[PDB]
Amino acid sequence: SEEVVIAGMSGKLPESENLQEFWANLIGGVDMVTDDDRRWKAGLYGLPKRSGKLKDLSKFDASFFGVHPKQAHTMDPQLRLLLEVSYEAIVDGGINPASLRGTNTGVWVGVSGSEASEALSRDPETLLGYSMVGCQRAMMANRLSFFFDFKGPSIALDTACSSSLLALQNAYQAIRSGECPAALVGGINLLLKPNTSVQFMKLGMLSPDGTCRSFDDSGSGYCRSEAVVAVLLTKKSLARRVYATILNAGTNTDGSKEQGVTFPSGEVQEQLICSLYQPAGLAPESLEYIEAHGTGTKVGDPQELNGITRSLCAFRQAPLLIGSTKSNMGHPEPASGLAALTKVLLSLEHGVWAPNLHFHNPNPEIPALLDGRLQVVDRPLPVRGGNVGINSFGFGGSNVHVILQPNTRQAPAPTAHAALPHLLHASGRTLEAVQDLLEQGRQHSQDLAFVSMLNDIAATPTAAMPFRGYTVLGVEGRVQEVQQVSTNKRPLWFICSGMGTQWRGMGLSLMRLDSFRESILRSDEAVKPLGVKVSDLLLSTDERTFDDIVHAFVSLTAIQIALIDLLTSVGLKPDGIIGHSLGEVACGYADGCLSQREAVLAAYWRGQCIKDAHLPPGSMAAVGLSWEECKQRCPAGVVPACHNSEDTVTISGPQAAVNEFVEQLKQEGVFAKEVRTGGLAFHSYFMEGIAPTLLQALKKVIREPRPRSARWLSTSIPEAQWQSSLARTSSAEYNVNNLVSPVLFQEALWHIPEHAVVLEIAPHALLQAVLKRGVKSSCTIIPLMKRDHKDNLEFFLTNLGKVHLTGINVNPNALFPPVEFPAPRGTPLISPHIKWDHSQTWDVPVAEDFPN
Ligand SMILES: *C(=O)CCCCCCC
């Protein structure tokens, strides 16, 4: 009573470096059996020249897997390959391995030989202990468990040829029962030692021509082959990708047989199949296809298919499609079950059955081939729908059978709201690793599930995946960056900018994201009573809307909250918050001191209370002087208002002594420009007369002032005084002090640590230059919006991209409506686009490392 699915798969098979190459060979009808000298001189000892072999055994990203080089040279290639294939298989499922660490996830590996362990133990004087650690069969599973921190069962099992499908049947049982949430299931087989082939030849088990002629009259033995295959199973609840569901699996053993231990009992094979179908409530009628063991043997093939005839065809009207992967690539012995499995799932994902090779004349000892009750797939056929069975048998008598219900979910009808641009992250071991995943994005941008899933696997520790990239999909250009990443952890700082960041139609672009639009609608709910709507102000044809002080104050705050609402939804929590002027209202909200209604109302009243009040005229100017040298050369009346950098400082004072300090300053050609303030001298004693009206209004808005965290640095209160009762809370008192006191901005930037990532939360990034000049060189500075820029959603995505690029983990899936998993059938494979760093080349045992 727990539904088990096949979530993810990867492999290397003969002439197939990954499952895309394997699929190309299958649907292409390319024989993957070869007669070159890769493993040993062809014909040696009178052996068949033909065998299925891997393109390469020498490559292993040793350092990603925490394997030191001395250890990698003395590790069974089986394991080196299975670590890579196992990683491949998990992420293929759209599952971040991190999510399975520390869980009771189990590992089961079919493996029948470590030829390598004999090779590397031959010379006592120069052998290495690490060779025990890298070749002992338990490790073919125990190493997987160790690397992935999987704490369920970790078991290497031998039932000869049925071993890997038995591993499937065990992982299945462990998940059906609740013992395990998930399970990695492996099959491995290599042909390093020729003496092993000689054994099989002399037993009469090998076709001289190296061909599994499955189901054919001339079947006279099998072709030995290599395989490395990994499959992730999960309970349905955890799945994103779902190739198929396991309706049922089981194993029996032939037991006693007159004919001998290695004669395959079709009667007992039949017993096994009969036990799994009607008794479990599954009709043979519901099978479209059976993957037979199909080794192409005088005895095996008739025993097997006559079994299939009596157990399944006997209770069917339609013919049963049958096939065997062994025709295509040979028998990879214990890996047979999982090789056969991948052929079945690739066929289903592509909507076409790959055909057998070598099916010329049917085996006349098999009635159901001659009367068409069993119909060999000898030519690509469309997948018409139905369950799938798979057989795997060992020479000792172990039988396994697995029923699959293929996943047939179609993707949903395209919507108008998804014509939005999307953002794709990727991490990687190499530049090519990232470029390839991002190229798969571009190619399949309309596939919501694929992109969603690629985003999930991008969140990775940076010591392991030192290259990151993003790209924006759904936009005219080629928005993409990729780079090396830091290692050291990178604190995230929010800077909420102040005034001068307003512009006509600001935030209209972002109103397509729902978290943003929903923040603006909440903000509108605060100021409905006070007779204004932020949505309508953003929507204003009218050029001078944000010339009204209340319109600007409520809207800049409203948007700063909406941006903080987006960042929060993609998982970004600030380590430090710094405000500038009006900024300190949003900072409050970021820091969780101000509710959203408090923050938005605070901004309205700060505005309304300045409108209503009669204040001594002053002016404000920006001047190319430092904090200090400005105080020196200042008239009386004129005060340094905003300490921005050591380059820029904003002054305030009376309209006369300012429009005289600009001119006396341009004699010396110095940066000096009076700013539009509607004739108010902010951050000075000219604002003192706002305190009575505003302190009352805010007292009624911020009823129960809440503590400010150590993460929010005041720019309104000097550091010396951060311990005061005023600075304790975002009080009505705090927000009045803000308007009449200087902005101690540079003073606070000093406190931003090394390697920090600094985001300017503002509808235009005014403070970029200032921030750069004010914070340490290490620190990365990132804007979120710019005025009159064609698409601001594209600019936001682009800049979220830049955050992911710093090694800070961002998951953009949350910006758009969630994908409904399981992912639709035919979502593209991820396993083939996981590139490694194969720069190094590792020892492989060779024929002469074994005796003669
Ligand atoms: C399948 O039953 C053939 C025998 C498996 C042993 C392979 C490795 C020694």
Author numbering: 1 to 852
Paper text:
De novo fatty acid biosynthesis in humans is accomplished by a multidomain protein, the Type I fatty acid synthase (FAS).
The MAT domain binds the octanoyl moiety in a novel (unique) conformation, which reflects the pronounced conformational dynamics of the substrate‐binding site responsible for the MAT substrate promiscuity. Besides the rigid domain structure, we found a positive cooperative effect in the substrate binding of the KS domain by a comprehensive enzyme kinetic study.
